[PDB]
């Protein structure tokens, strides 16, 4: 059984979302009303699943990560509303699928980070934008520390979610807005981070595919702006 | 938007001359045998009409046709002559096909006929589906191609001292079709 | 007759990733047809020699 | 007092001879390209029917076309012929046109067509409105005119040893109008 | 009394729309039923007033025109309407007001001219954008003209109004979608064109503003789009 999700032009095949993790079991919303709150909302055209370009998961590779919104920083719509508005904020559903054949042993673990600040400064440093950052064992930020000098051990803490390959191949973590305020600017701030590492080195037989790809399919939800309606009276 | 200029019929119903029998008139001088032509009624010259039924296997359908004629003497001679008059003979499947000019098969009573003088307006008649099974068939996969008679014409004015040659098309257009089983088109190209 | 209409592109999104010796050669094929609110109008044959 | 005869139709409906078409027999003898004439109808020309048409921005109307024709000897010869018999083909827009005397065009089953003996009722058609848009235009504002189609008629004896000239008027006659956004008329004088 | 017209961001004074005329007495509308019929339909944005620069009115000034939709090739959100559409159809208010002072005799009729083809060919030629083209009294098509030979006297059959300025001294033409089709590109094709002819010519007293101004408010109305929207099936 396989569902097809949409989002206007675009649309997603989903085997079986059955393992779908929301972020702290919280369902992103918009902003309650706790027009005066200025709730410019183009739920439009910036919520379809956008597709980010495929990483090459191999035996050597150490890890990938990608900040959100960043990422979008240049799909198309959502991306332009990150720039004629000053304010906003969305959540996510971030989708992950890898398809491999049954013959590849190999197991990424997903974890979504709230104010992922990777560690070891400079802008563009860390917003990789849409080709994403990666890791390395030993810039690169530390892979088992995720920059910040943390025993790999403990990420399961955040919102994570494991493709193990002799079981399920996709993954979709779900993150609602998070962040210290209730509105932002979603260009200068990113409230996730999306990294993926693999537990289980990707292992597969003699003559197979040595590099098994995996995307994000990350698509913006229920965002907002802030607004540029004045008000004239008579 | 609507389908209607797509059906069967819009598509097939269509006059197309498929052929032209060409006679003399019998002038007695030298007139050697173009004194009758004939045909076997076939759409297989007509790419065009063929081409569209061979898009199926099997159809049925009443053929109507009719008969344009056009004359002119054959010498700049002070051509003289009375307005002539011609016989079309239809000759159902499985009958005798004329042969000579004066055969008796123009006489004989089967064949329905025409005399159509010329100039005047263009003769006409229409043969009902006439297969002797129950549709004519565009292929087939068997052992011992289907009929739809004989034309035959004739000038009928006989001792003309004035050679006068006359072309008549034949304009064949299928009504009340109906077709079977439809197949890939042949290119264009083979025919 | 001549120009637009559009365009159907088919982009490698991920490698096709395949388990043993079965070959790195698959194939597509592809169909196309009419729906129910196709229509056509004004009949015009050339088929001709 | 009444407005009648000045409504849309009893302005536009009038009988207009929009051109003469004129071919010659296929006189084997020299005859150069005469042999069929072809015209694509459009108004501009009779400066009398396109005016009243500027007239306004847009309209619809079904076009019928009667054919007057009229033949005569070039040489004062003892010029003898059966009486002739043309061909009219209407070819729908964005159809081929003939080319040559006995281009396949003619055969071709799309193309309406007119077999009018020469000393008769003049023959006459009426092809419905055919834009393929919801209006012929009479100006526009944009970039890559109308059509309605192309008459081609020739002569269908062929042999004839007499050059016989015709000329064929075509009486095409506006019915069943309707305008829209009138507009001021331009000077008779730009024309 | 003035009424304070708005379309979102943008508003428009205006003394009195009580000589407001629709070309045909036919309010533009959409497309009637007569989502199968493809109405993609951004009435949000692209429905504001938008001000073409000011002409400066003279003596010896001939005409103005201008070519719509082509006029709003440009302006922001409409402007760009017309070009990830392939086909649209939109009416449009034209809001023309020429403020003079009291001592500024002068008259102008604005027309509008469905398929208005200005006679003398090259694209770039009849499309003067948001500039506007003028006419000349002898390139320039003829003013008493208007490009094709006809006397002026009659273009007051074309939806018009008179600004003559010892009265009204603002007009308001309302163009409903008029064309042989029932949609359209309406990049390659100005279904209207408003020219602005001076039947009295201005003439004020001593030293005043010798040129006064005359301003263009077009606001497209009732606007809608082609379809990029495809289907699948499962």
Redesign the interface.
């Known amino acids: 059984r396989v569902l097809q999700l949409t989002l206007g032009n675009s649309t997603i095949t989903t085997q079986e979302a059955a393992n779908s993790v929301v972020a702290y079991g919280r369902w992103p919303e918009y902003l309650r009303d706790s027009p005066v709150d200025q709730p410019t909302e183009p739920d439009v055209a910036a919520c379809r699943f956008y597709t980010l370009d495929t990483v090459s998961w191999t035996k050597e590779s150490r890890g990938w990560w990608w900040k959100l919104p960043d990422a979008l920083r240049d799909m198309g719509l959502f991306g332009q509303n990150m720039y004629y508005h000053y304010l906003g904020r969305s959540g996510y559903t971030v989708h992950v699928q890898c398809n491999a054949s049954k013959f590849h042993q190999g197991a990424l673990g997903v974890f979504a980070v709230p104010e992922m600040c990777l560690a070891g400064t400079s802008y563009q440093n860390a917003n990789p934008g849409e080709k994403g950052g990666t890791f390395t064992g030993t810039f690169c930020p530390v892979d088992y520390l995720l920059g910040n000098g943390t025993l790999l051990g403990n990420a399961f803490v955040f919102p994570h979610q494991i493709i193990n390959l002799r079981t399920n191949n996709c993954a979709t973590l779900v993150l609602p807005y998070v962040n210290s305020l209730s509105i932002d600017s979603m260009v200068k701030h990113n409230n996730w981070g999306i990294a993926i590492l693999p537990l289980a080195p990707l292992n597969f037989a003699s003559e197979s595919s040595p590099e098994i790809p995996i995307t994000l399919t990350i698509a913006p939800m229920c965002c907002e702006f802030n607004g540029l309606r004045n008000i004239t009276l008579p | ?6 059906s069967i019929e ?2 097939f119903a ?4 498929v052929t032209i029998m060409t006679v003399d008139n019998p002038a007695s001088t030298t007139n050697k045998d173009k004194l009758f032509a004939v045909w076997k009624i076939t759409y297989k010259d ?4 063929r ?2 039924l061979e898009f199926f296997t099997y159809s049925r359908f009443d053929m109507e046709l009719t008969f ?1 004629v ?7 001679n ?4 009375l307005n002539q008059v011609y016989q079309i003979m239809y000759v159902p499947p499985g009958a005798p096909v004329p042969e000579k000019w004066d055969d008796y098969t123009w006489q004989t009573s089967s064949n329905p006929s025409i005399f159509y003088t ?3 307006a ?1 003769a006409r008649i229409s043969v009902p589906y006439v297969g002797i099974s129950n549709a004519y068939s565009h292929f087939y996969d068997g052992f011992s191609l289907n009929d739809f008679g004989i034309l035959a014409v004739r000038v009928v004015n006989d001792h003309n001292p004035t050679k ?2 006359s ?1 008549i ?1 034949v304009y064949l257009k299928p009504k009340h079709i109906r077709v079977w089983c439809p197949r890939p088109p042949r290119a ?1 190209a083979y ?1 | 007759i001549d120009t637009e209409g559009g365009y159907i592109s088919v982009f490698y999104q991920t490698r096709i990733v395949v388990p043993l010796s079965t070959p790195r050669e698959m194939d597509i094929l592809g169909f196309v047809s009419a729906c129910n609110d196709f229509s056509v109008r004004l009949l015009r044959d050339t088929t001709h020699i």
């Open positions: 938007r609507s389908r209607s200029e797509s819009s598509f269509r006059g197309a001359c007509t790419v065009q009409l081409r569209k344009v056009t004359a002119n003497f054959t010498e700049t002070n051509g003289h002559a010329y100039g005047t263009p006068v040659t072309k098309r264009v025919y």
